[PDB]
Write a protein that binds this ligand. Structure first.
Ligand SMILES: *[C@@H]1O[C@H](CO)[C@@H](O[C@@H]2O[C@H](CO)[C@@H](O[C@@H]3O[C@H](CO[C@H]4O[C@H](CO)[C@@H](O)[C@H](O[C@H]5O[C@H](CO)[C@@H](O)[C@H](O)[C@@H]5O[C@H]5O[C@H](CO)[C@@H](O)[C@H](O)[C@@H]5O)[C@@H]4O)[C@@H](O)[C@H](O[C@H]4O[C@H](CO)[C@@H](O)[C@H](O)[C@@H]4O[C@H]4O[C@H](CO)[C@@H](O)[C@H](O)[C@@H]4O)[C@@H]3O)[C@H](O)[C@H]2NC(C)=O)[C@H](O)[C@H]1NC(C)=O
Ligand code: Y4C
Ligand code: CA
Ligand code: CL
Ligand code: K
Ligand code: NA
Ligand code: NA
Ligand code: ZN
Length: 806
């Protein structure tokens, strides 16, 4: 119940939301069906439209008008945005030359530059170039301010997950808005786009910017607007709030536009009908900037123009139906569209089997336009698993396609020509970022970045301490003229041991054998040096990784590679090696095929053993430093040390062997040398974070050798590829991956073919940021470079996407 008999008199767009059953006058009252009876009359005035005209100049104030052209309007803060242009001979903001804003130029009483967020739904990154002719205001913001060629949204590339990621700095799995539609099994409640359940606070986790601001004494405008409030009224409301007394005035504001998403769904991303929505958004930007200029705030406010996701061409005919795959289609519930989520229709049905469902959906049709995954097997870059609202079974849908349960769902729900929600690496899903104001840089282009990073920057812009989030604070310092955040490197927690030769061969009873007993102070002195780290500067280019948790580990040096060997996990946490452009690939000699050698620096009790591999019929082994890339026949023996061995399913060995034998050399030739750091990852609870020992669900049979869920590699070279990786004087270039350690290659439909037809494709799908690997391993990389820490943070957030040019 709401007693709507109260009044909005002097309360229009009030900032504090009044509690029930008292009627509301705020910008969300319509959405709650709770506005006072006179809200439309008083707060949504439309008379005479939105623009001053010559004959309205100096008019007698008529309070009925939507906006004013009278002489008193500036002090009242309610002129039409074009007032000074029409009535006072001023120019529109867009017609002014841009001039660097070196310092905030603010009216007296302003304690900080306000921040205005202008968010646009469905604003695809390529609109900045493709629509440039019809968006002069936005184009001026872009060229005069700081801009990225694009900004990467989060997965799924849906509206609510992205807007709330923007607001919180969190992945959807952490903030809890994991789709536009959700079922929470603990609440036993459903979240929908239409309805009232979505208003319950329990869905919305983390701490959004408006709450962070309020808790730290920075006043915030209300970010959300009821659909029926016209854009012109939203702008006028913001401008009116900016005229409040200092003690009452917010420092942070948001405008939201439902366009171009609304039209993009109907007409496709580049439908000829899309020009008008783009023109109209630009006009709104013009109104804001003209309004700011009138208030003498155009060189004081920081403005962020930001989108949530792009838009792809998608039509009804491009729909895959689960009824063409499953016999039992009525025993499931599907969340459909540009992603699929499957669960049992009834929790009381004991015939339901996720294993048989996945199999029935796996590589069944030649051109199949979706791929099934257990959520924990999704690419780690998506960070889409650690939430009870995310169903165990997920369908990654090809761009341009839908998945639905049955054909009747599609014609009894073509209408639409556009949609979004696909993998967040997809070019059509990319969106926009422009920052303009005293705190942003002048005429500066910055590399693409992820929207999870913005919360930290918005906190910086407002002098706020950010709540704990998934951004890497400092990684976007290069966007800013001032207010940069200067982080310190995390402290190493565990110092390594440096073991020398401490064990005789015969102390080892590992069931390993090697044909290495085929035997000089000239070379014996030399190998002693190598074991003491004489080549470490070549193979460890950026310092040793820091171990940021409590553990027991050894640094092991070799001619060709260096490792940090965990006595706890019985394998390296990391293995580092450099391969020059000139390096040659060799084979594993016949006599060494099954060679495994005890490491006399490491105790039998802290070593793996070959017998466990013999006994475990499912599990084989591989090596982290590849024997194929040994610098010499004698150095090759180092590669067969038991301390370089890791457990690998035979199916995974196909992937790993191809990476190591073919791809590393290929990258070294293309990139002028590469430094490689590889290692295991253990993430059995799929939280994106390093497992402790007691979280490991699988061991090599009969042993304490834990099985990795994933294997990573970080591949670094010089950004200026005229310089070799090991002699680089400037910025670095990186690509990384986190490959799932799976007992089959079911993910790769073409895996029965030669590795050259499918392995690199798989690796590209599992591309990763160094930062993702840091979370998953508790390691901190690039500790010793000649580069600024902020630059290194940006490098650590880089994702190599393998898409063509935007
Ligand atoms: C991205 O950034 C985020 C933010 O930094 C990272 O997420 C953090 O990770 C931490 C470690 O996983 C986690 O810390 C835990 O906090 C527990 C208290 O959590 C509540 O309070 C916080 C603070 O206000 C709040 O943010 C939380 O909000 C979550 O839950 C609510 C409702 O459930 C949701 O609305 C909200 O969306 C959010 O959900 C997300 O996180 C939860 C986990 O909290 C997931 O379950 C969801 O799926 C979703 O992703 C909470 O309201 C605290 O109790 C924990 O301490 C326990 O666990 C450790 C064991 O390791 C132990 O030391 C403690 O003693 C204690 O153990 C006891 O409980 C165990 C479990 O029941 C039990 O097994 C034991 O026997 C003990 O009884 C823990 O410290 C932190 O909450 C989240 N924060 C957020 C916002 O998600 C994230 O990791 C980053 N991602 C990457 C890839 O880097
Ligand atoms: C801090 C980063 C800012 C991101 C940022 C900026 C602006 C918004 N605003 C909106 O999304 C909006 O107005 N939606 C209208 C429908 N609403 C649906 C949800 N229940 C209220 C009505 C959100 C996030
Ligand atoms: Ca984990
Ligand atoms: Cl969804
Ligand atoms: K085996
Ligand atoms: Na052997
Ligand atoms: Na396969
Ligand atoms: Zn949409």
């Amino acid at each position: 119940w709401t007693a709507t008999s109260g009044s909005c008199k002097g309360r229009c767009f009030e900032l504090q939301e009044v509690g029930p059953p008292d009627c509301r006058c705020d910008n969300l009252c319509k959405s709650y069906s709770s506005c006072c009876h006179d809200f439309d009359e008083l707060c949504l005035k439309t008379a005479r439209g939105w623009e001053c005209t010559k004959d309205r100049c100096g008019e007698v104030r008529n309070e009925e008008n939507a906006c004013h052209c009278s002489e008193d309007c500036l002090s009242r803060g309610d002129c039409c945005t074009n007032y000074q242009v029409v009535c006072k001979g001023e120019s529109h903001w867009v017609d002014d030359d841009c001039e660097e804003i070196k310092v905030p130029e603010c009216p007296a009483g302003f304690v900080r530059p306000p921040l205005i967020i202008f968010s646009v739904d469905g604003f695809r990154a390529s609109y900045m170039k493709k629509g440039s002719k019809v968006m002069p205001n936005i184009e001026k913001l872009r060229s005069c301010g700081t801009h990225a060629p694009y900004m990467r949204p989060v997965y799924p590339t849906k509206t609510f997950p992205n807007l709330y990621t923007l607001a919180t700095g969190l992945y959807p799995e952490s903030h809890g808005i994991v789709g536009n539609s959700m079922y929470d099994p603990v609440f036993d409640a459903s979240f929908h786009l239409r309805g009232r359940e979505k208003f319950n606070h329990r869905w919305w986790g983390g701490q959004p910017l408006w709450i962070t601001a309020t808790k730290q004494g920075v006043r915030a405008g209300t970010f959300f607007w009821s659909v029926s409030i016209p854009h012109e009224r939203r702008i006028l409301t913001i401008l009116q709030w900016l005229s409040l007394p200092d003690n009452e005035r917010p420092s942070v504001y948001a405008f939201y536009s439902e366009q171009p998403d609304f039209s993009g769904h109907k007409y496709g991303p580049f439908g000829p009908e899309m020009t008008n929505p783009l023109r109209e958004i630009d006009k709104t930007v013009g109104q804001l900037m003209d309004g700011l200029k009138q208030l003498r705030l155009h060189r004081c406010v920081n403005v962020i123009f930001v989108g949530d996701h792009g838009m792809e061409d998608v039509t009804c005919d491009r729909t895959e139906f689960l009824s063409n795959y499953l016999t039992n289609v009525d025993d499931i519930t599907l969340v459909p569209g540009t992603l699929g989520r499957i669960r049992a229709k009834s929790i009381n049905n004991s015939k339901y089997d996720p294993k048989t469902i996945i199999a029935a959906l796996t590589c069944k049709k030649p051109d199949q336009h979706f791929k099934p995954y257990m959520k924990q097997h999704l690419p780690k870059r998506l960070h889409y698993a650690n939430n009870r609202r995310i169903e165990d079974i997920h369908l990654l849908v090809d761009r341009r396609w839908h998945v639905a349960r049955k054909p009747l769902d599609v014609y009894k729900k073509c209408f639409f020509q556009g949609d979004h929600g696909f993998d967040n690496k997809v070019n059509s899903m990319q969106t926009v970022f422009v920052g303009y104001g005293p705190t942003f840089k002048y005429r500066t282009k910055v590399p693409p970045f992820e929207n999870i990073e913005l919360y930290n920057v918005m906190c910086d812009l407002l002098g706020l301490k950010p709540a704990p989030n998934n951004g890497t604070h400092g990684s976007l310092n290069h966007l800013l003229r001032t207010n940069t955040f200067r982080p310190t490197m995390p402290d190493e927690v565990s110092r390594p041991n440096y073991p020398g030769i401490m064990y005789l061969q015969s102390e080892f009873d590992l069931g390993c054998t090697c044909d290495d007993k085929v035997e000089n102070k000239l070379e014996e002195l030399n190998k002693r040096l190598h074991t003491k780290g004489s080549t470490k500067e070549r193979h460890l280019l950026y310092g040793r990784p820091a171990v940021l948790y409590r553990t027991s580990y050894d640094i092991l040096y070799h001619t060709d590679f260096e490792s940090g060997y965990s006595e706890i996990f019985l394998m390296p946490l990391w293995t580092s090696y450099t391969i020059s452009k000139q390096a040659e690939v060799s084979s594993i000699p016949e006599h060494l095929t099954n060679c495994v050698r005890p490491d006399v620096r490491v105790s039998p009790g802290f070593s793996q053993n070959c017998l466990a591999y013999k006994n475990d019929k499912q599990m084989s082994y591989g090596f982290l430093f590849p024997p194929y890339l040994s610098s010499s026949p004698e150095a090759k023996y180092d590669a067969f040390l038991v301390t370089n061995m890791v457990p690998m399913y035979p199916a995974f060995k196909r992937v790993w062997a191809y990476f190591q034998r073919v791809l590393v050399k290929k990258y070294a030739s293309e990139r002028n040398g590469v430094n490689v750091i590889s290692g295991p990852i253990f993430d059995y609870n799929y939280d994106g974070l390093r497992d402790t020992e007691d979280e490991i669900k699988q061991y090599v049979e009969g042993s304490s050798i834990p099985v990795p869920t994933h294997y990573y590699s970080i591949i670094t070279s010089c950004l200026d590829f005229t310089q070799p990786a090991d002699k680089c004087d400037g910025p670095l270039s990186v690509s990384s991956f986190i490959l799932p350690h799976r007992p089959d290659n079911d993910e790769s439909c073409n895996s029965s073919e030669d590795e050259s037809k499918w392995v690199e494709e798989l690796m590209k799908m599992h591309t990763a940021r160094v930062r993702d690997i840091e979370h998953l391993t508790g390691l901190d990389f690039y500790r010793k470079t000649s580069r600024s820490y902020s630059e290194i943070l940006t490098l650590k957030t880089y994702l190599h996407t393998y898409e063509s040019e935007i």
